[PDB]
Amino acid sequence: TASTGFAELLKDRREQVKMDHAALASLLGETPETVAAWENGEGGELTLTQLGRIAHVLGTSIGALTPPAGNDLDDGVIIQMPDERPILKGVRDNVDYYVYNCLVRTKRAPSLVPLVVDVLTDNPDDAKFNSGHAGNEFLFVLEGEIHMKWGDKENPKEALLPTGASMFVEEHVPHAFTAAKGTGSAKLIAVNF
Amino acid sequence: TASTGFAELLKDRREQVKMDHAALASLLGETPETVAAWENGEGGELTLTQLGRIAHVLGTSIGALTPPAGNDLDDGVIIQMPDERPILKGVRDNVDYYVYNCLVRTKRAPSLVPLVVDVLTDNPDDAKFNSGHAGNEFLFVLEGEIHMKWGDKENPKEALLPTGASMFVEEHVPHAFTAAKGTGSAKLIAVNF
Amino acid sequence: TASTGFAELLKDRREQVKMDHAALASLLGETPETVAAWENGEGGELTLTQLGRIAHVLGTSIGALTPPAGNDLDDGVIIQMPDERPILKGVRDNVDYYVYNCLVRTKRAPSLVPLVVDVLTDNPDDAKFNSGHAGNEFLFVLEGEIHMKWGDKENPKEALLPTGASMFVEEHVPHAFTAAKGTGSAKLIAVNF
Amino acid sequence: TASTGFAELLKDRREQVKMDHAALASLLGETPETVAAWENGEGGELTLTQLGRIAHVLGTSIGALTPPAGNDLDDGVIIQMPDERPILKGVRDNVDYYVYNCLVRTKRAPSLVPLVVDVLTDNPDDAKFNSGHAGNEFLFVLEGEIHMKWGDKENPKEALLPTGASMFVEEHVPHAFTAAKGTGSAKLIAVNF
Ligand SMILES: C[C@@H](O)CP(=O)(O)O
Ligand SMILES: C[C@@H](O)CP(=O)(O)O
Ligand SMILES: C[C@@H](O)CP(=O)(O)O
Ligand SMILES: C[C@@H](O)CP(=O)(O)O
């Protein structure tokens, strides 16, 4: 089906730009039958590069010729239990900064990446900024008091957030968190979308 | 500025469809000076209906002629403290079903509506479905055990979710929650986007 | 209607951000009955600025609250006869540069603005550049020979185009046209989509 | 390159969903070194199906992982001469119905497919409907008189269009053309955007 979505999108496009197997094969240096093969479902083994070419000849992108991520929902829903969360230990400059408890995701919303981040450090002076990232992010202070930092890492803005505080960080904005000074650690809910 | 964004978008469009004050005024039954007035910043008092017409004559929509919601961020961020959350008591069939503790919102993401919902009822048999709503929603079980229901209200699907469970409910999918049977109540984090 | 579209959309939004009449009415300095009235179609008299405030209060834009341009097609089609097309003389620096013969348009595609442009001047050295414009444009040399100029007005790239040539000009790219030198006039058919 | 675009995009995604090489490599039955290799441009040989799996595992689509069609403009412009335009004979039911004279196209606007269509038949009763097609279309009667048909092939609406007429056909709406009866042939200029 990753080879079927292609079979038809290739056809949609070939006809969209007004070509035929013979005409297309020619720009790609392939037999007119080869092409028809792809349009059947035999495109499965085409290499990434080969797809870069095909997309090119048809003046479009690989993405346009491939199918969208399938649908992984059970009647519009998808659940995840606490003990099935993927865990990722985050380390910045050989320091256990965060711990990512990845929450439920769906191919129907590829950009939605929910997380429960354990903020390990509690020394604001050593907060480590990222360079910011694409996608707006909504945060919620689960437990503890969070020490937030955003903007220019050199002279950034700050905020002390109590449990229950809710934040929004526009995409590309650099930011960093730590537990409140000396308080040990805090927990957070970060939802990227 | 709700009258300025208009002043220029009106101009952008008038010229976009190749008209002049005189030509435009004519389709609207207005003086050529009236129009120029609007394009200055004097459009402020134009009624909704009057705007429905102007958009029509210019074969576009009111929205296209009005400015986007401003920007309400402090260097890409916006915080909200626990004691400044708007509260809305939800009642279904004269029953205190939920309680909406509205979290941080931003005009930069008009669709993002974060909530902390208190699920008051604990009798799954009397769960009240909505008709579903636009926008995907991410849920997280804050406290208690949640009894979820989705799909057809008559013969719906169910799920018992422990604290920490995370769900996703595709837009338009009907759903309902209650505390686990007899457990009194549960708390949830619902993020619509 | 605009007052009906607004009445349905306003209700949706209010409910989205979890506000009841009372709640919304407060932030606006209005009475719950007034807000209920609006959702009942009685909002047509609302000025552009109050709509701007209502929008802001509901943390969104006026467009989100107003209805789509609407549909003016006839079973999916909209036709226009040669004799019924709008005209606009384009003068630049006190010299008739173009004449715009506006072709079919539609609310189902506002961004689409097709035209038949009469290139009046025939002296390249006195070409008059535009500043570029939102939206891409497709052109077709109808009659005569066109001498196209695009890019930096103080140093443009050029191309002499014969009848039948077709070109694409990405948005916000500046460009200018004139008939081939001495040839008097040329004719294009521009399509802004 | 496709292998470079994929290499940069793959890295972004992996980091987005909070997976390290090891984590991703596992779900794919590959070694951490292999995954690191891909992010290092060495992924060109990957077949369409593995790309489909890698995509799926990263809960997204192949397109999200591949680069944009690319840019083929010349300082914002792309030109095409009359003699260099592609041609495709359109036969329906064993009868030459159209001849497609493909105009300029671009990767910066794949959806844009302009054409000069020669309407070969001149008998309305034997019109050959298409099934409609994605994307809206703008038409212009170049030569002759066109006898347009759209809608339900078993009961179409009709319109005789003189040279210079312009029409819009919303996407997925079926339509057919033929020269005015007996007039031999007509000429259109179709633009699918
Ligand atoms: C809370 C989380 O957003 C921090 P980072 O992963 O973006 O650096
Ligand atoms: C949890 C929340 O989404 C229930 P409803 O407000 O959509 O009915
Ligand atoms: C041909 C036409 O696009 C010239 P301008 O109206 O954009 O200045
Ligand atoms: C004029 C052209 O649009 C006819 P078809 O190619 O869509 O069938």
PDB file of C-alpha atoms in Angstrom, chain B residues 2-3 6 13 16-20 43-49 51-52 56 59-63 66-69 88 100 102 105-107 110-111 113 115, chain C residues 2-3 6 13 16-20 43-49 51-52 56 59-63 66-69 88 100 102 105-107 110-111 113 115:
ATOM      1  CA  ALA B   2      -9.321  46.884  13.156  1.00  0.00           C
ATOM      2  CA  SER B   3     -10.158  49.769  10.857  1.00  0.00           C
ATOM      3  CA  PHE B   6      -9.247  47.031   6.484  1.00  0.00           C
ATOM      4  CA  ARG B  13      -8.225  43.893  -3.304  1.00  0.00           C
ATOM      5  CA  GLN B  16      -6.224  43.233  -7.328  1.00  0.00           C
ATOM      6  CA  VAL B  17      -9.448  42.944  -9.307  1.00  0.00           C
ATOM      7  CA  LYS B  18      -8.478  46.001 -11.335  1.00  0.00           C
ATOM      8  CA  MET B  19     -10.964  48.611 -10.121  1.00  0.00           C
ATOM      9  CA  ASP B  20     -10.708  52.265  -9.086  1.00  0.00           C
ATOM     10  CA  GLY B  43     -14.150  52.412   7.430  1.00  0.00           C
ATOM     11  CA  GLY B  44     -14.545  51.983  11.183  1.00  0.00           C
ATOM     12  CA  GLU B  45     -18.329  52.422  11.346  1.00  0.00           C
ATOM     13  CA  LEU B  46     -19.263  50.240   8.376  1.00  0.00           C
ATOM     14  CA  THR B  47     -21.934  47.770   9.489  1.00  0.00           C
ATOM     15  CA  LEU B  48     -21.538  43.995   9.210  1.00  0.00           C
ATOM     16  CA  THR B  49     -24.110  43.925   6.428  1.00  0.00           C
ATOM     17  CA  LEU B  51     -19.219  44.695   4.742  1.00  0.00           C
ATOM     18  CA  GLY B  52     -21.083  41.690   3.399  1.00  0.00           C
ATOM     19  CA  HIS B  56     -19.519  40.587  -2.480  1.00  0.00           C
ATOM     20  CA  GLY B  59     -16.056  38.829  -5.222  1.00  0.00           C
ATOM     21  CA  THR B  60     -14.258  37.831  -2.022  1.00  0.00           C
ATOM     22  CA  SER B  61     -15.176  37.346   1.667  1.00  0.00           C
ATOM     23  CA  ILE B  62     -15.377  39.733   4.642  1.00  0.00           C
ATOM     24  CA  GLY B  63     -12.529  37.809   6.230  1.00  0.00           C
ATOM     25  CA  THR B  66     -10.239  42.227   7.489  1.00  0.00           C
ATOM     26  CA  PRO B  67      -6.950  41.845   9.386  1.00  0.00           C
ATOM     27  CA  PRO B  68      -5.851  38.642  11.175  1.00  0.00           C
ATOM     28  CA  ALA B  69      -6.240  38.498  14.962  1.00  0.00           C
ATOM     29  CA  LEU B  88     -17.354  27.508  33.225  1.00  0.00           C
ATOM     30  CA  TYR B 100     -14.171  23.893  32.484  1.00  0.00           C
ATOM     31  CA  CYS B 102      -9.904  27.290  30.700  1.00  0.00           C
ATOM     32  CA  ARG B 105      -4.884  30.760  24.771  1.00  0.00           C
ATOM     33  CA  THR B 106      -3.247  32.948  22.125  1.00  0.00           C
ATOM     34  CA  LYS B 107      -4.512  34.820  19.081  1.00  0.00           C
ATOM     35  CA  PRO B 110      -6.893  30.668  17.568  1.00  0.00           C
ATOM     36  CA  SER B 111      -7.657  26.941  17.465  1.00  0.00           C
ATOM     37  CA  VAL B 113      -8.045  25.745  23.426  1.00  0.00           C
ATOM     38  CA  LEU B 115      -8.609  22.955  29.329  1.00  0.00           C
TER      39      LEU B 115
ATOM     40  CA  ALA C   2     -23.460  37.866   6.655  1.00  0.00           C
ATOM     41  CA  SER C   3     -25.583  38.308   9.800  1.00  0.00           C
ATOM     42  CA  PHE C   6     -21.807  35.495  11.794  1.00  0.00           C
ATOM     43  CA  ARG C  13     -16.600  30.089  18.743  1.00  0.00           C
ATOM     44  CA  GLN C  16     -15.308  26.522  21.626  1.00  0.00           C
ATOM     45  CA  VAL C  17     -13.552  28.769  24.135  1.00  0.00           C
ATOM     46  CA  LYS C  18     -16.079  27.639  26.744  1.00  0.00           C
ATOM     47  CA  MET C  19     -17.903  30.914  27.315  1.00  0.00           C
ATOM     48  CA  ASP C  20     -21.615  31.271  27.981  1.00  0.00           C
ATOM     49  CA  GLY C  43     -25.994  41.269  14.437  1.00  0.00           C
ATOM     50  CA  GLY C  44     -26.054  42.926  11.021  1.00  0.00           C
ATOM     51  CA  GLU C  45     -25.798  46.466  12.399  1.00  0.00           C
ATOM     52  CA  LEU C  46     -22.536  45.740  14.233  1.00  0.00           C
ATOM     53  CA  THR C  47     -19.802  48.108  13.102  1.00  0.00           C
ATOM     54  CA  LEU C  48     -16.455  46.892  11.790  1.00  0.00           C
ATOM     55  CA  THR C  49     -14.776  47.911  15.047  1.00  0.00           C
ATOM     56  CA  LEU C  51     -16.663  43.056  15.255  1.00  0.00           C
ATOM     57  CA  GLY C  52     -12.971  43.656  15.702  1.00  0.00           C
ATOM     58  CA  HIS C  56     -10.309  39.928  19.839  1.00  0.00           C
ATOM     59  CA  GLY C  59      -9.145  35.452  20.804  1.00  0.00           C
ATOM     60  CA  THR C  60      -9.608  35.083  17.052  1.00  0.00           C
ATOM     61  CA  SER C  61     -10.136  37.089  13.861  1.00  0.00           C
ATOM     62  CA  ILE C  62     -13.129  38.731  12.182  1.00  0.00           C
ATOM     63  CA  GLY C  63     -12.753  36.365   9.253  1.00  0.00           C
ATOM     64  CA  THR C  66     -17.720  35.725   9.112  1.00  0.00           C
ATOM     65  CA  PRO C  67     -19.059  33.431   6.328  1.00  0.00           C
ATOM     66  CA  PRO C  68     -17.275  32.357   3.101  1.00  0.00           C
ATOM     67  CA  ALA C  69     -17.514  34.681   0.098  1.00  0.00           C
ATOM     68  CA  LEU C  88      -9.740  49.699 -16.535  1.00  0.00           C
ATOM     69  CA  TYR C 100      -7.340  45.670 -18.406  1.00  0.00           C
ATOM     70  CA  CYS C 102     -11.223  41.556 -16.913  1.00  0.00           C
ATOM     71  CA  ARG C 105     -14.005  35.568 -11.773  1.00  0.00           C
ATOM     72  CA  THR C 106     -15.674  33.759  -8.867  1.00  0.00           C
ATOM     73  CA  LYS C 107     -16.193  33.750  -5.079  1.00  0.00           C
ATOM     74  CA  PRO C 110     -11.279  34.910  -5.144  1.00  0.00           C
ATOM     75  CA  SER C 111      -7.528  34.723  -5.732  1.00  0.00           C
ATOM     76  CA  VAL C 113      -8.081  37.131 -11.521  1.00  0.00           C
ATOM     77  CA  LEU C 115      -7.300  39.313 -17.698  1.00  0.00           C
TER      78      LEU C 115
END
